[PDB]
């Protein structure tokens, strides 16, 4: 059957999908998730889209406000809007699984809400593709590839120039912060190859 | 987080092996989730983040993937021009171009709601700090507007079953990560993914650049600069955080860099030592790497020339011996609080000591505090993240190197003084300070251990789950938050592949109403505790095997 969606836990709880077709697959993804990790999961889509507040009152409105300036909501839906079919398949389908589970969890609290709902003072609502894609952008992207220090940066080659003078600031600031240091052991040893590009490390820009 | 890939030049009773330790913190429930999707494509196994629907770390019985952060630099600052007469643009390309902007509230519980504009320029998003009249700052990451593609390449490279398809679902995760690959044959490959900028001439991207228009990046560079390994002749990949290849510039932060210092030399050594590695002892090389400190090896040397022709008595030299005669590989005491060895304190004051001295003397307030600490520094609940060689440390390696740095040492850390003096002085702090603490018989030391904590606030400081759900572990462990290890064509095994993993504290984190924990809530954190961990399995027949539950949905879109 092309509605059939099977899904088999194992030893440790650990679930297992079988279906035909995107869509089914990730419901079920989605299903089990749901049945798992319904309030990590709402804490999650809260985090990254800066709506703690909401729940747990005026300590997390600066953590809201910060979430919120660090990402812009229409560029996501955009690419969304842009995605394929069988791509768009994965999302929705993630969503509408959970949201299966959401609406039996809603229907008959008394014995599927987990705890932490009744605890922290709301109930679960359900998903779109949007909030999948922020979990991702809000835990991954956002945690682990959004890194930088420029400002801070300049702002001690400015100090270090100030108190050593022009070049030898420069020069210590590359005895601090070097571009690139060639006796940093590598994950790719050097006869197999190198990084062909130079960059500039005197702050040229300037 | 860290990885260690071995090929088939150096797999024993296999063809590749496969071992990733991500570090993402410790959290109740668990950071990651396990799932097996088979269907519509996909065969595969494993566990990954908030359970994205993509695995980050699994198999599918051809070839397996794993990942740890990269840490390249993709993302510059641009410092746009304003003015007081046109608010809400900025120059751009000779004219005065409109940002873009939006109205959030943020809706508060039993509290007032708030709201604020948010805006962005051609270069991204602004900053809040570091505003004037004339300056606000746009962060611009070479991965904007590439969020989906780095998702969906992520869920796509799931269905590879080479080399060749695999790293063309490399080459659009946009995000800076490294990626790993092994597969059934025992071929081992490595990526270090993402989008990375093609900036223009004399564009130092330590440094902020002018958002008027010059300094605009060119483009993207492309897939071919991203540093790659297919099957190395070194047979196998390591890495630990640190640089991928030679000459390939790090991360902007201050606190970040790659130099000779590096923590991945720890595994480097225990691939090395062993010409060829088991399943068992490549499983084996996380408990080794998670107790090792880190320093020892570094500044030994440099302990033991200065200490080297002091008389016996010297209790500044009796510290060295100390820490000579260590493995450096902390244990714990069987009361379950203390290290059976005092080597990590030693260490800890004496650097402290050390950067104090030189680093951190060298350096104008208040930037001085960036290079003060030690990398032993952490709370009662204990790290909340890996351990690591701290920024000051690895500059001080630098220059205990002397000649031996390829780094010119503009002004010298030890100010005219000798090394050895130096060195001395911090060894007299560490036993002024350890002697004072636990008296004079170093033999019977009994310093703090450090713990491990699975937080009920996840990464961002916000619950996601009531505080009484904290797990709490005696040994910290400088290792994965969960640490999955693939092995292909095992010779004692009748599959072509063999999986394990440990999600801790367990695949589920749900409570019934009236409290009643799920069967899988804690069952896997005993395991984590001791090395331990439990089958991934693939096959229709595997799964069948060791089912306990099952659920058949009828649904139509
Ligand atoms: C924890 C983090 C890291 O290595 O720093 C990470 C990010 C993305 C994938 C794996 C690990
Ligand atoms: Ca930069």
Known sequence: SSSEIKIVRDEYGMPHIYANDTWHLFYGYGYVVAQDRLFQMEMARRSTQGTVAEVLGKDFVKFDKDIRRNYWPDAIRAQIAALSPEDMSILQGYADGMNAWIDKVNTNPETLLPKQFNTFGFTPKRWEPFDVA??????????????????????????????????????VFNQLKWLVNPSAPTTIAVQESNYPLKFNQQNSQT | SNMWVIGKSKAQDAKAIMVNGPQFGWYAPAYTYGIGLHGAGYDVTGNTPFAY?????????????????????????????????????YLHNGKWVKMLSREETITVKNGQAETFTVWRTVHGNILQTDQ??????????????????????????????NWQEWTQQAAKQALTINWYYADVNGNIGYVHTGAYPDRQSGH??????????????????????????????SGYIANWNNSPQKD????????????????????????????????????????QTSRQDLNLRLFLPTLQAATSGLTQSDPRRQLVETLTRWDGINLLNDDGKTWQQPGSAILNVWLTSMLKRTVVAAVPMPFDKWYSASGYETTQDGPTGSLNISVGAKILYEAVQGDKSPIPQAVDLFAGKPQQEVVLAALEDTWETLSKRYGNNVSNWKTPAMALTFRANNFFGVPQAAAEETRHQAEYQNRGTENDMIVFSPTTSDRPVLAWDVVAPGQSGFIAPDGTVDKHYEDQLKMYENFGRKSLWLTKQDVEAHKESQEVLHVQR
């Open chain 2, 248 to 287: 390939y510039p790090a991360s902007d932060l201050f606190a970040f860099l790659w130099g000779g210092a590096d923590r991945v030399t720890e595994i480097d050594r225990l691939l090395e030592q062993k010409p060829r590695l088991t399943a068992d002892q490549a499983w084996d090389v996380i408990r």
């Open chain 2, 132 to 161: 004037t009249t004339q300056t606000a700052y746009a962060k611009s990451r070479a991965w904007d507007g590439k969020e989906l593609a780095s998702l969906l390449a992520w869920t796509h490279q799931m269905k590879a079953k």
């Open chain 2, 204 to 233: 130092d991207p330590r440094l902020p650049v002018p958002g008027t228009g010059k300094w605009d990046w060119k483009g993207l560079l492309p897939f071919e600069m991203n540093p790659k390994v297919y099957n190395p002749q």
């Open chain 2, 53 to 89: 629907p993509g695995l980050v770390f699994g198999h599918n019985g051809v070839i397996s993937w794993g990942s740890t952060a990269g840490f390249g630099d993709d993302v510059d600052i641009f410092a746009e021009r304003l003015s007081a007469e046109k608010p809400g643009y």
């Open chain 1, 134 to 171: 922020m979990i991702f952008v809000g835990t991954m992207a956002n945690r682990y590839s959004d890194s930088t220090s420029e400002i801070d940066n300049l702002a001690l080659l400015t100090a270090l120039k100030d108190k050593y003078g022009v070049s030898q600031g420069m020069a």
